[PDB]
Design an enzyme around this catalytic site. Structure first.
Site, PDB file in Angstrom:
ATOM      1  N   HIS A  41       0.933  -1.265   0.129  1.00 13.40           N
ATOM      2  CA  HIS A  41      -0.026   0.033  -0.029  1.00 13.40           C
ATOM      3  C   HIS A  41       0.833   1.211  -0.096  1.00 13.40           C
ATOM      4  O   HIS A  41       0.277   2.223  -0.170  1.00 13.40           O
ATOM      5  CB  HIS A  41      -1.021  -0.046   1.235  1.00 13.40           C
ATOM      6  N   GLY A 143       2.989   6.079  10.554  1.00 11.45           N
ATOM      7  CA  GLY A 143       4.374   6.163   9.964  1.00 11.45           C
ATOM      8  C   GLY A 143       5.059   4.540  10.475  1.00 11.45           C
ATOM      9  O   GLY A 143       6.147   4.342   9.857  1.00 11.45           O
ATOM     10  N   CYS A 145       3.927   1.438   9.448  1.00  7.18           N
ATOM     11  CA  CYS A 145       3.866   0.248   8.647  1.00  7.18           C
ATOM     12  C   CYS A 145       5.279  -0.186   7.932  1.00  7.18           C
ATOM     13  O   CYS A 145       6.170   0.847   7.811  1.00  7.18           O
ATOM     14  CB  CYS A 145       2.768   0.579   7.411  1.00  7.18           C
TER      15      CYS A 145
HETATM   16  C1  LIG Z   1       0.669   2.404   8.503  1.00  7.54           C
HETATM   17  C2  LIG Z   1      -0.669   2.590   8.686  1.00  7.54           C
HETATM   18  C3  LIG Z   1      -0.960   1.753  10.018  1.00  7.54           C
HETATM   19  C4  LIG Z   1      -0.488   2.454  11.252  1.00  7.54           C
HETATM   20  C5  LIG Z   1      -1.292   3.725  11.725  1.00  7.54           C
HETATM   21  C6  LIG Z   1      -1.479   3.701  12.864  1.00  7.54           C
HETATM   22  C7  LIG Z   1      -0.887   2.576  13.893  1.00  7.54           C
HETATM   23  O1  LIG Z   1      -0.730   1.441  12.640  1.00  7.54           O
HETATM   24  N1  LIG Z   1      -1.600   1.869   7.865  1.00  7.54           N
HETATM   25  C8  LIG Z   1      -2.671   2.422   7.214  1.00  7.54           C
HETATM   26  O2  LIG Z   1      -3.156   3.587   7.827  1.00  7.54           O
HETATM   27  C9  LIG Z   1      -3.757   1.589   6.455  1.00  7.54           C
HETATM   28  C10 LIG Z   1      -3.286   1.985   4.796  1.00  7.54           C
HETATM   29  C11 LIG Z   1      -4.354   1.163   4.025  1.00  7.54           C
HETATM   30  C12 LIG Z   1      -4.098  -0.272   4.178  1.00  7.54           C
HETATM   31  C13 LIG Z   1      -4.435   1.649   2.665  1.00  7.54           C
HETATM   32  N2  LIG Z   1      -5.006   1.813   6.729  1.00  7.54           N
HETATM   33  C14 LIG Z   1      -5.350   1.465   7.888  1.00  7.54           C
HETATM   34  O3  LIG Z   1      -4.618   1.172   8.944  1.00  7.54           O
HETATM   35  C15 LIG Z   1      -6.796   2.095   8.259  1.00  7.54           C
HETATM   36  C16 LIG Z   1      -7.043   3.220   9.373  1.00  7.54           C
HETATM   37  C17 LIG Z   1      -8.269   3.739   9.353  1.00  7.54           C
HETATM   38  C18 LIG Z   1      -9.209   3.213  10.380  1.00  7.54           C
HETATM   39  C19 LIG Z   1     -10.624   3.764  10.269  1.00  7.54           C
HETATM   40  C20 LIG Z   1     -11.083   4.673   9.420  1.00  7.54           C
HETATM   41  F1  LIG Z   1     -12.220   4.844   9.285  1.00  7.54           F
HETATM   42  C21 LIG Z   1     -10.039   4.821   8.178  1.00  7.54           C
HETATM   43  C22 LIG Z   1      -8.539   4.419   8.402  1.00  7.54           C
HETATM   44  N3  LIG Z   1      -7.487   0.957   8.989  1.00  7.54           N
HETATM   45  C23 LIG Z   1      -8.582   0.399   8.296  1.00  7.54           C
HETATM   46  O4  LIG Z   1      -8.995   0.592   7.282  1.00  7.54           O
HETATM   47  O5  LIG Z   1      -9.417  -0.626   9.114  1.00  7.54           O
HETATM   48  C24 LIG Z   1     -10.746  -0.913   8.398  1.00  7.54           C
HETATM   49  C25 LIG Z   1     -11.738  -0.201   8.893  1.00  7.54           C
HETATM   50  C26 LIG Z   1     -12.504  -0.661   9.844  1.00  7.54           C
HETATM   51  C27 LIG Z   1     -13.749   0.026  10.243  1.00  7.54           C
HETATM   52  C28 LIG Z   1     -14.157   1.114   9.508  1.00  7.54           C
HETATM   53  C29 LIG Z   1     -13.162   1.675   8.378  1.00  7.54           C
HETATM   54  C30 LIG Z   1     -12.314   0.718   7.954  1.00  7.54           C
HETATM   55  C31 LIG Z   1       1.000   3.411   7.555  1.00  7.54           C
HETATM   56  C32 LIG Z   1       0.187   3.883   6.224  1.00  7.54           C
HETATM   57  C33 LIG Z   1       1.128   4.696   5.446  1.00  7.54           C
HETATM   58  O6  LIG Z   1       2.651   4.656   6.118  1.00  7.54           O
HETATM   59  C34 LIG Z   1       2.371   4.100   7.319  1.00  7.54           C
HETATM   60  O7  LIG Z   1       3.082   4.025   8.017  1.00  7.54           O
END
Ligand SMILES: *[C@H]([C@H](C[C@H]1CCCO1)NC(=O)[C@H](CC(C)C)NC(=O)[C@H](Cc1ccc(F)cc1)NC(=O)OCc1ccccc1)[C@@H]1CCOC1=O
Ligand SMILES: *[C@H]([C@H](C[C@H]1CCCO1)NC(=O)[C@H](CC(C)C)NC(=O)[C@H](Cc1ccc(F)cc1)NC(=O)OCc1ccccc1)[C@@H]1CCOC1=O
Ligand SMILES: [Cl-]
EC number: 3.4.19.12
Lengths: 301, 305
Positions: A41, A143, A145
């Protein structure tokens, strides 16, 4: 004596940690030999987060679209491919710090160390367990990931986890190093929820054995139980079923302490019924379930 | 989000760990520049156990009596001396993996990471606090003496602890890297005991702030207290006194969460008088006191090294 949440020394992994940038996204990668592994991603755009087609996004990239920095040195990317949910960037330099290593996919209940990283730089190390619902209860910020989980049992680093997402409940999901998610999760921001979590019963029993090894017996009783009856009780507290495999695995600790496994099971049944009544076990006022039988032997002997 | 007992990355210290042997005693040493540091009791025999005269025991030793192994390479000892309870072995080669470092003595309530080692080989890392009674609740087996504790500031390793002994309650005692003991302990096998311990109040408050940052709020209430009134409760429950310095140090967390320290103090007072009523905070059923205010800021803001 003593008993701590004890991680593996992190130096062998620190030497592998790099920063990967694509577009406006920066996260961590794992530099082993001439390959940098990171979550795919990193190629997602701000408009690609709900239903990205990663095959289509990747075919549009050139090698020079990936900026990889190892400390102060930029690594030249000379190829890329995707394996499930992980991106593999070929670089023109093999990491001189690559340890002996393997990739392993772990089962729920297994523990591992996490090296939390930001911008390719380590921030700290802690112990985790793969929960029965295939999440991990990590400590991660924006940050993070591409941070990885690992064990180092005999001078060989076994990489088992790479961090991809945070669910709204504050727990975490990721992949093995072949890019296959643990659990049913997908690297899309569509609504997803983990199953109800449960307690890792075999680990609680291992930790009770650690308590006896360290000299504490107050929670034992004079009873035994059948495996069936224990499971009927334990599941009423949202504990995982205990299998004959688990009973076999606890044989060594049972032999060392003189406490038959099903006798420990009777102690656990009473602890669930009574609580701790103001006492503690190995410094905790709850039944700890993120130490495996193997972890206990590693730390107590 | 999330909150874990988090150690510093240990790589900078792993490259300093060596094995030291004298007679039949083998333990760990810390190789920095051209000196290897280790506990002075490495020169003790099974009959020197009880009432050793270290000055006398050291005179009979020659440089070759100390076998120092860094991995599979034996280091040549070219001098020795003793500083307080630590032995310093000068070797003919500077450690090429010596990090930026300094020796620092910490205060009770401060935390640090322990790199547990056996036969010169790092085996595990975990976070500890120096207890108010100057012990640490470590995890150590036979052969772990000379394991070290440290913090990292800004690429500089601050070494603060060397492991020397285990007390009958299973807690541990050691020295700073200048060989000064923490606590009223001596390096001989005479009867010794840890004093009654107390809880590190400022750390409990820091951990309550961490809980609030992570969405755990059930323990908040409308009340505030005074420092005087709280310390009367603190003394009653074997908690360390809360000073104005502690209140100042928690300032950042008070501002970030909107809970004044004395506001949080009223929460803590109620938790002490009433308990947690079947609830947990950050996955614990106890009031956790091995996170400092800086630990909470570092973990919740993503500081790197
Ligand atoms: C890493 C980051 C994870 C970090 C952030 C805090 C601790 O771990 N990864 C991401 O942000 C992911 C990127 C996608 C795979 C494209 N997304 C998520 O982790 C999302 C966060 C989120 C949560 C809720 C939301 F409404 C919107 C976004 N999690 C997610 O989508 O869970 C599914 C969900 C459940 C319920 C409702 C909606 C969604 C990162 C990213 C970039 O660089 C890094 O270091
Ligand atoms: C390190 C080792 C400490 C390890 C051992 C397990 C985890 O930490 N250090 C030693 O063994 C110390 C050597 C002396 C300084 C000469 N001795 C002690 O730690 C003793 C052990 C002990 C404990 C409890 C007892 F009842 C008796 C002995 N601790 C001690 O002296 O406590 C005082 C006391 C109380 C009551 C009665 C008698 C004494 C080592 C050692 C060599 O190599 C290593 O790695
Ligand atoms: Cl496994």
């Amino acid at each position: 004596s003593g008993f701590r949440k004890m991680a593996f020394p992190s130096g062998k992994v620190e030497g592998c940690m790099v920063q990967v940038t694509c577009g406006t996204t920066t996260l961590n990668g794992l530099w082993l030999d001439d390959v940098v592994y990171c979550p795919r991603h990193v190629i997602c755009t701000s408009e690609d987060m709900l239903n990205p087609n990663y095959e289509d996004l990747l075919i549009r990239k050139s090698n020079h679209n990936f900026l990889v920095q190892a400390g102060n040195v930029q690594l030249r990317v000379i190829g890329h491919s995707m394996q499930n949910c992980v991106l593999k960037l070929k670089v023109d330099t093999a990491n001189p710090k690559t340890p002996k290593y393997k990739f392993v996919r772990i089962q729920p209940g297994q523990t591992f160390s996490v090296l939390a990283c930001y911008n390719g730089s380590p921030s700290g190390v802690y112990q985790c367990a793969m929960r029965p619902n295939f999440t991990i209860k990590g400590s991660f910020l924006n940050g993070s990931c591409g941070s990885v989980g690992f064990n180092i049992d005999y001078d060989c680093v076994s990489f088992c986890y790479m961090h991809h997402m945070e669910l709204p409940t504050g727990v975490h999901a990721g992949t093995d190093l072949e890019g296959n998610f643990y659990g049913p999760f997908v690297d899309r921001q569509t609504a997803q929820a983990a199953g109800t979590d449960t307690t890792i019963t075999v680990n609680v029993l291992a930790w009770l054995y650690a308590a006896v090894i360290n000299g504490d017996r107050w929670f034992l009783n004079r009873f035994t139980t059948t495996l069936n009856d224990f499971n009927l009780v334990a599941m009423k507290y949202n504990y995982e079923p205990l299998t004959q495999d688990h009973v076999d695995i606890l044989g060594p600790l049972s032999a060392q302490t003189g406490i038959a496994v099903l006798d420990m099971c009777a102690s656990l049944k009473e602890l669930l019924q009574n609580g701790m009544n103001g006492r503690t076990i190995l410094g905790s006022a709850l039944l700890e379930d993120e130490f495996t039988p193997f972890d206990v032997v590693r730390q107590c002997s």
